[PDB]
């Protein structure tokens, strides 16, 4: 297991997300679904010229998996996936510059819900989760698990769990007071409100 420090700007972004009073927490799901859609777009485009990139799985979809027993909400996609290098480099995001652009878009009146416009929507996960695990598999690398409970550090390790084929799984270990996001009707409501026109099948698993 390797432990890394977040860049100062990202730790600041996470501290802001965790500590700022902001009731509209449901946007985290929109942001994660958007990321999955972006990753799915990428493997789709690459497969147009090289269909063998789909040997790791032809289906392009997003699954939402609540587990009330574990208090986890998991978002799984079969997009392009991330390499180990991507994970360490802020999960394939432009997080340093994006955080800068977000930080003082906020000072120009913006609110937290615009976070995705600055490429760092992922970190909105910390509105609802005390810990986030990101398990990912890119065609060119092995399957890795990234994890952080904030506090300035993250870990990366080779994943031992179920083979994913290709794509990304974001596991949200929910805060005690945020269990509404495990309820079927709440999830459906949020998907219909914010993600109605995502161009990939979104399947909400039941328990
Ligand atoms: C908005 O920033 C993003 C969005 C998606 C990704 C991404 C992902 C990916 C990343 C995340 C976050 C953990 C950041 C996610 O929730 C879902 C995903 O499928 N897998 O491969 C990728 N690699 C990519 O190059 C792609 C298409 C965007 C990385 C950065």
């Amino acid at each position: 297991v390797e432990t890394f420090a977040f860049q100062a700007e990202i730790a600041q972004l996470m501290s802001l997300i965790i500590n700022t009073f902001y009731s509209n927490k449901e946007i985290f799901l929109r942001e994660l679904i958007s990321n999955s859609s972006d990753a799915l777009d990428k493997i789709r485009y690459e497969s147009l010229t090289d269909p063998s990139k789909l040997d790791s799985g032809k289906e392009l979809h997003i699954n939402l998996i609540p587990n009330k027993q574990d208090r986890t909400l998991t978002i799984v996609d079969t997009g392009i996936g991330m390499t180990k290098a991507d994970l360490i480099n802020n999960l394939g995001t432009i997080a340093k510059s994006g955080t800068k652009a977000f930080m003082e878009a906020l000072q120009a009146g913006a609110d937290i819900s615009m976070i995705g416009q600055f490429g760092v929507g992922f970190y909105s996960a910390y509105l609802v989760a005390e810990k986030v695990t990101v398990i990912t598999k890119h065609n060119d690398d092995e399957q890795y698990a990234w994890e952080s409970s904030a506090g300035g550090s993250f870990t990366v390790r080779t994943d031992t769990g179920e083979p994913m084929g290709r794509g990304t799984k974001v596991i949200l270990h929910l805060k005690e007071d945020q269990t509404e996001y495990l309820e079927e009707r709440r999830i459906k409501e949020i998907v219909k409100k914010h993600s109605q026109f995502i161009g990939y099948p979104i399947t909400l698993f039941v328990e």
Side-chain angles (χ1 to χ4, degrees):
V1 179
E2 296 177 289
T3 305
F4 299 84
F6 286 111
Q7 281 165 292
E9 294 85 347
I10 285 73
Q12 187 175 11
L13 172 67
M14 297 173 74
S15 196
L16 185 151
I17 289 166
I18 287 165
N19 298 315
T20 304
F21 180 81
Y22 183 76
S23 301
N24 186 30
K25 290 177 179 285
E26 75 189 36
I27 57 92
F28 80 91
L29 186 62
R30 175 187 72 196
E31 298 306 325
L32 296 176
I33 292 174
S34 175
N35 285 0
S36 290
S37 179
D38 292 350
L40 287 160
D41 287 349
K42 189 161 184 185
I43 186 62
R44 167 150 280 159
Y45 183 79
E46 295 198 3
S47 74
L48 293 180
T49 59
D50 186 356
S52 68
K53 287 178 176 184
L54 293 182
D55 286 350
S56 46
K58 288 178 180 170
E59 291 74 28
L60 301 186
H61 62 243
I62 299 171
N63 296 330
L64 306 178
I65 312 171
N67 189 307
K68 286 178 181 174
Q69 290 64 46
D70 296 342
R71 209 166 85 204
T72 59
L73 177 61
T74 300
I75 299 91
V76 183
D77 69 65
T78 48
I80 190 80
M82 289 170 285
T83 63
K84 185 184 181 182
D86 291 327
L87 284 178
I88 296 167
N89 191 8
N90 301 309
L91 309 109
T93 73
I94 49 156
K96 180 185 178 161
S97 61
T99 297
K100 171 185 185 66
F102 181 43
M103 274 312 194
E104 224 74 335
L106 286 186
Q107 275 284 57
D111 73 279
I112 294 184
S113 68
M114 279 166 261
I115 188 167
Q117 301 185 35
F118 309 107
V120 291
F122 166 70
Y123 300 94
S124 72
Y126 291 91
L127 295 169
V128 300
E130 60 186 16
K131 182 168 69 175
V132 178
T133 308
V134 176
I135 301 170
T136 194
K137 175 67 174 69
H138 183 281
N139 283 335
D140 299 339
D141 209 349
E142 303 313 315
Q143 186 163 307
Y144 282 96
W146 175 104
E147 194 169 66
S148 180
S149 295
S153 68
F154 64 90
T155 62
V156 177
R157 72 196 72 191
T158 296
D159 187 49
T160 56
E162 295 302 305
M164 296 171 63
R166 185 200 62 253
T168 298
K169 165 166 53 176
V170 177
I171 305 174
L172 305 175
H173 307 264
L174 295 180
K175 298 171 186 177
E176 209 173 12
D177 67 331
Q178 301 297 328
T179 57
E180 70 191 84
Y181 302 111
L182 301 177
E183 299 291 336
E184 184 182 16
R185 56 186 191 179
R186 184 67 172 115
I187 298 163
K188 282 179 180 167
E189 179 185 41
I190 301 168
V191 172
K192 185 197 178 304
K193 181 173 184 177
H194 295 292
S195 304
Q196 188 186 352
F197 303 113
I198 294 290
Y200 300 96
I202 299 171
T203 300
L204 171 58
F205 285 30
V206 290
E207 311 185 55

